[PDB]
């Protein structure tokens, strides 16, 4: 406000969301 991550910043999930490249992000 945070996902800074393979692109994107905003947006998310109501109390939680998966965000990976490509591996692992786990959130």
Aim: glycine share 4%; proline share 0%.
């Amino acid at each position: 406000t945070e996902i800074r991550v393979g692109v994107t910043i905003r947006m998310r999930x109501s109390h939680x969301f998966w965000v990976q490249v490509x591996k692992e992000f786990k959130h």
